[PDB]
Amino acid sequence: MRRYEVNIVLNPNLDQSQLALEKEIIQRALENYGARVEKVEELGLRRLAYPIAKDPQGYFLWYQVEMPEDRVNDLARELRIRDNVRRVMVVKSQEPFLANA
Amino acid sequence: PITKEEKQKVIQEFARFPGDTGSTEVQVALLTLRINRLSEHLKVHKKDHHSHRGLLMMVGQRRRLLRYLQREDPERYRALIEKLGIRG
Amino acid sequence: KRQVASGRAYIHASYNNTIVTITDPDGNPITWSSGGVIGYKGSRKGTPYAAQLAALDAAKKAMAYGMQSVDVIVRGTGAGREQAIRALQASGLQVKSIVDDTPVPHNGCRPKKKFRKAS
Amino acid sequence: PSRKAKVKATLGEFDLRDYRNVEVLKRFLSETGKILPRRRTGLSAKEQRILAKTIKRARILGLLPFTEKLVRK
RNA sequence: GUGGGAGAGGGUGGUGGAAUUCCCGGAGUAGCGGUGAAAUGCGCAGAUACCGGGAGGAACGCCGAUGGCGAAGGCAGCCACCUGGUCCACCCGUGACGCUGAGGCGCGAAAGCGUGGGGAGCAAACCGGAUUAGAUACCCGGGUAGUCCACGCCCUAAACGAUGCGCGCUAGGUCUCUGGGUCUCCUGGGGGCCGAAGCUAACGCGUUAAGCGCGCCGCCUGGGGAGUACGGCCGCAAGGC
Numbered sequence: 001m002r003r004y005e006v007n008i009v010l011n012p013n014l015d016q017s018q019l020a021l022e023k024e025i026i027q028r029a030l031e032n033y034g035a036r037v038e039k040v041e042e043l044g045l046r047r048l049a050y051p052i053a054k055d056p057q058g059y060f061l062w063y064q065v066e067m068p069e070d071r072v073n074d075l076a077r078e079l080r081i082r083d084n085v086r087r088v089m090v091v092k093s094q095e096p097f098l099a100n101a
Numbered sequence: 102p103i104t105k106e107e108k109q110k111v112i113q114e115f116a117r118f119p120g121d122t123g124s125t126e127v128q129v130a131l132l133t134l135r136i137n138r139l140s141e142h143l144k145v146h147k148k149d150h151h152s153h154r155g156l157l158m159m160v161g162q163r164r165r166l167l168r169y170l171q172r173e174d175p176e177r178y179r180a181l182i183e184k185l186g187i188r189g
Numbered sequence: 190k191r192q193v194a195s196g197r198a199y200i201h202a203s204y205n206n207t208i209v210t211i212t213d214p215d216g217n218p219i220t221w222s223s224g225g226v227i228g229y230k231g232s233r234k235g236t237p238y239a240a241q242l243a244a245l246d247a248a249k250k251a252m253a254y255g256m257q258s259v260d261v262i263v264r265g266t267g268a269g270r271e272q273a274i275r276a277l278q279a280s281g282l283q284v285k286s287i288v289d290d291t292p293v294p295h296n297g298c299r300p301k302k303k304f305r306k307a308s
Numbered sequence: 309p310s311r312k313a314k315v316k317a318t319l320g321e322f323d324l325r326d327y328r329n330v331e332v333l334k335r336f337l338s339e340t341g342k343i344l345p346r347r348r349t350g351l352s353a354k355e356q357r358i359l360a361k362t363i364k365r366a367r368i369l370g371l372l373p374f375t376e377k378l379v380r381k
Numbered sequence: 382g383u384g385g386g387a388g389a390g391g392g393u394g395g396u397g398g399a400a401u402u403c404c405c406g407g408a409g410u411a412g413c414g415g416u417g418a419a420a421u422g423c424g425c426a427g428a429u430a431c432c433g434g435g436a437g438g439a440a441c442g443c444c445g446a447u448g449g450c451g452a453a454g455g456c457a458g459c460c461a462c463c464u465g466g467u468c469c470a471c472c473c474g475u476g477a478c479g480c481u482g483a484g485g486c487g488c489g490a491a492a493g494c495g496u497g498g499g500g501a502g503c504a505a506a507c508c509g510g511a512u513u514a515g516a517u518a519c520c521c522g523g524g525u526a527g528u529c530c531a532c533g534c535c536c537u538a539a540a541c542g543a544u545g546c547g548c549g550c551u552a553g554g555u556c557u558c559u560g561g562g563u564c565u566c567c568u569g570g571g572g573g574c575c576g577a578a579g580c581u582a583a584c585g586c587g588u589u590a591a592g593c594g595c596g597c598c599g600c601c602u603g604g605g606g607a608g609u610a611c612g613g614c615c616g617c618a619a620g621g622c
C-alpha cells in the first residue's frame with residue numbers, strides 16, 4: 001500500500017459525452033485495481049510544448065491515489081488501452097523539496 | 102521489501118527476553134528472513150548477480166553466528182535450528 | 190508560375206558544398222540553387238564565394254516568381270554559411286528572420302570513423 | 309561567466325520536485341530546450357540533480373520542450 | 382535494534398523525444414557526394430535540398446563535472462516492481478562472536494563459439510576508386526560475419542592506482558560530494574590538490590602513505606630461448622591455466 005500520483009493526458013477534442021465515458025472507464029479501472037482516491041485536480045486543456053498525436057494541445061488529469069504496490073504497473077497498462085488516452089505517467093509521491101527557502 | 106511490523110514480529114518471536122534486539126538468536130532469525138526473501142527473489146531474476154553476492158555475505162554471517170552459538174551453548178543452537186528449520 | 194511573394198529560405202551548408210532551397214510558407218519548394226548549379230564542380234563548391242553565387246541565384250529565381258520577404262533557415266556547419274546569409278540579406282529580398290535548425294542527435298547512431306571520437 | 313542573473317536569485321519560494329509547474333521550470337531552460345548549467349541556475353548539486361529529473365518528467369508529459377529552434381544569428 | 386540519508390549499484394516490465402536509414406505522398410530540377418586534388422558511387426525509372434505521413438533498429442543530447450555508485454569487470458532518457466551495498470545520529474541489545482584466507486565455489490570489458498531471433502547506423506574479411514617506385518595501408522564509395530536480444534559456452538587484457546586485505550599510530554592548508562550539530566564553525570564517511578615528520582635510486586609518496594608497526598595470502602630471483610615444448614586439467618572450437 002503506497003501513495004502514488006497518476007498523470008493522464010487525453011484528447012482535447014472530446015465532447016462532454018466521450019470525455020465523460022473516458023473518465024468513467026478511468027474511475028472504473030481504478031476501482032477494479034483498488035486505488036483509493038485522496039484528491040483530484042482537473043486542469044483541462046493546455047498547450048503542449050511539442051505536438052503529441054499531431055495535436056498541439058492536450059487535456060490533463062491528476063489523481064493522487066493510494067494503491068497496492070504490486071499492481072501499479074498492471075494498472076498503467078489498462079489505462080493505455082483507450083485510443084483517447086495519449087499519455088499515462090505514474091509517480092511515487094514525494095515530500096516537496098523546497099529551494100531558495 | 103521487509104516492513105517494520107514483520108521485523109518486530111520476528112524480533113519479539115526470537116527475543117531471549119523482553120527488550121532484547123541484539124542476541125545471536127535474533128540476528129540469525131533476521132538474517133534467515135532476509136535470506137529466504139532474497140532467494141525467492143533469485144528463483145526469478147536469476148541473472149542478477151550483484152544481489153547474489155549479498156546473499157553469499159548474509160549466508161556467511163549466519164553460518165559464523167550459528168557456529169558461535171554451537172560453541173557456547175549447543176542447547177540454544179539445536180533449539181534455534183529446530184525453530185528455524187535450517188541445515189536442510 | 191505561382192506568385193507566392195513570401196516564403197522560406199533553407200541553407201544547407203557543409204565543408205563540401207552549400208545548397209539553397211527556397212520554398213513557400215508550407216515548406217514546398219519553388220526553386221533552388223547550389224555550387225553545382227553554378228559552373229563550379231570540384232572542391233570549389235565549398236567556397237564562400239560559391240555559396241554567395243548560389244544564394245544569389247536562388248534569390249533571382251525567386252524574383253521570377255515575384256517573391257519579396259523570406260525567412261531564412263540555416264542547417265549545417267560549413268564554410269560560406271554566413272556568406273549565403275549576407276548574400277540573401279540584401280539580394281533585393283527582405284529577410285524577416287534567421288534561425289539555425291541544424292539537427293543534432295541525442296546520440297542515436299554510430300558515426301563513421303571520420304566523425305568518431307564521439308557518438 | 310554568466311554575470312547577468314542567477315535563476316535562483318531571480319526567483320522566489322518554489323518547489324523543485326514539482327514537475328507540473330511550468331512557469332518556473334521554463335526559467336531554468338535556455339533559449340533552446342536545454343537544461344541550464346550550474347553557472348546559470350545558481351543551484352547546488354542536490355538541487356540541480358533533482359531539477360534535472362523533474363524537468364525530464366515535465367518533458368515527457370509534454371509541458372516542456374526537448375529542444376527548440378534558435379532565433380536570430 | 383530504532384530513526385533518518387544519498388546514489389548511472391543490480392534484475393524485470395513498460396514507456397518518451399531527437400537523429401540516421403528505408404517506404405509512401407506533395408512540391409521541385411541537374412546534379413549530389415567526396416577529397417590535398419580527384420575518381421569509383423548515386424541521379425531523367427527524377428537523386429541532392431524542403432514539407433507531410435509511416436516502419437524499424439540502435440544509443441540516450443542538454444543536466445554532466447576535476448561529480449556519484451560498485452569487490453572487480455563495469456554502471457547514464459523516463460516510470461513502476463523486485464533486490465544488494467553503504468553512511469550519519471541515538472548508546473538500546475549480544476558479549477571477542479574477530480583478521481586473513483592454500484584448495485573449492487561464483488562473478489568477470491572487448492573479441493570469439495553454439496542454437497534461435499533481429500539487423501537502422503557502423504564495420505574485420507571481401508569488392509572497387511585513388512595515392513604510391515610498389516600500397517596486400519593510411520584517404521574515398523560499397524560491404525559479410527559481427528556489433529543488438531534470449532539461452533548456453535569462452536576466463537583473456539595496459540582486468541591499471543602498473544600500489545593485496547585488515548587494524549593501530551604520525552602537522553596542517555585547500556577544493557569538493559554526502560550526513561549530523563551549539564550551522565563564523567564543530568564533528569563523521571567518500572572523492573581531489575599542495576605540503577610537517579619520515580620514506581624513496583630518483584621521479585615522487587606523504588591521515589586515500591609508497592611513513593612508523595603487527596597479522597595473513599599471492600608473487601619475484603639476470604636477458605634471449607618462451608608464456609614456447611612435454612605432461613596434466615579445462616573447452617564444441619579458437620584456445621586457457
Ligand SMILES: NC[C@@H]1O[C@H](O[C@H]2[C@@H](O)[C@H](O[C@@H]3[C@@H](O)[C@H](N)C[C@H](N)[C@H]3O[C@H]3O[C@H](CO)[C@@H](O)[C@H](O)[C@H]3N)O[C@@H]2CO)[C@H](N)[C@@H](O)[C@@H]1O
Binds near residue numbers: 464
Ligand atoms: N536502484 C534503485 C534506486 O532507488 C532509489 O531509492 C533508493 C533509496 O532512496 C532508498 O534508501 C532506503 C531507505 O529506506 C532509507 N534511506 C534507508 C534504507 N537502509 C535504504 O534501503 C537500503 O537497504 C536495503 C537493505 O536493508 C536495500 O534492500 C535497499 O535497496 C537499499 N536502498 O532505497 C531505495 C531503493 O534502493 C530511487 N528510486 C532510484 O535511484 C532507483 O530506483
Ligand SMILES: NC[C@@H]1O[C@H](O[C@H]2[C@@H](O)[C@H](O[C@@H]3[C@@H](O)[C@H](N)C[C@H](N)[C@H]3O[C@H]3O[C@H](CO)[C@@H](O)[C@H](O)[C@H]3N)O[C@@H]2CO)[C@H](N)[C@@H](O)[C@@H]1O
Binds near residue numbers: 393439440529530
Ligand atoms: N528500455 C527497456 C529495457 O529493456 C531491457 O530488455 C529489453 C531490451 O533489451 C530488448 O530489446 C527490445 C526487442 O526485444 C524488441 N524486439 C524491440 C524493442 N524496440 C527493444 O527494446 C529496446 O531496444 C534497445 C535496447 O536493446 C533500445 O535502444 C530501445 O530504445 C528499446 N525499445 O527487449 C527487452 C524486453 O523484451 C530491460 N528490461 C531494461 O534494460 C529496460 O526495461
Ligand SMILES: [K+]
Ligand atoms: K556525371
Ligand SMILES: [K+]
Ligand atoms: K570519476
Ligand SMILES: [K+]
Ligand atoms: K628528495
Ligand SMILES: [Mg+2]
Binds near residue numbers: 080081084086
Ligand atoms: Mg492509447
Ligand SMILES: [Mg+2]
Ligand atoms: Mg569478509
Ligand SMILES: [Mg+2]
Binds near residue numbers: 205206
Ligand atoms: Mg564539394
Ligand SMILES: [Mg+2]
Ligand atoms: Mg538505477
Ligand SMILES: [Mg+2]
Ligand atoms: Mg523518425
Ligand SMILES: [Mg+2]
Ligand atoms: Mg519521393
Ligand SMILES: [Mg+2]
Binds near residue numbers: 414422423
Ligand atoms: Mg552514394
Ligand SMILES: [Mg+2]
Ligand atoms: Mg549506395
Ligand SMILES: [Mg+2]
Binds near residue numbers: 424
Ligand atoms: Mg542514370
Ligand SMILES: [Mg+2]
Ligand atoms: Mg551513371
Ligand SMILES: [Mg+2]
Binds near residue numbers: 425
Ligand atoms: Mg527524361
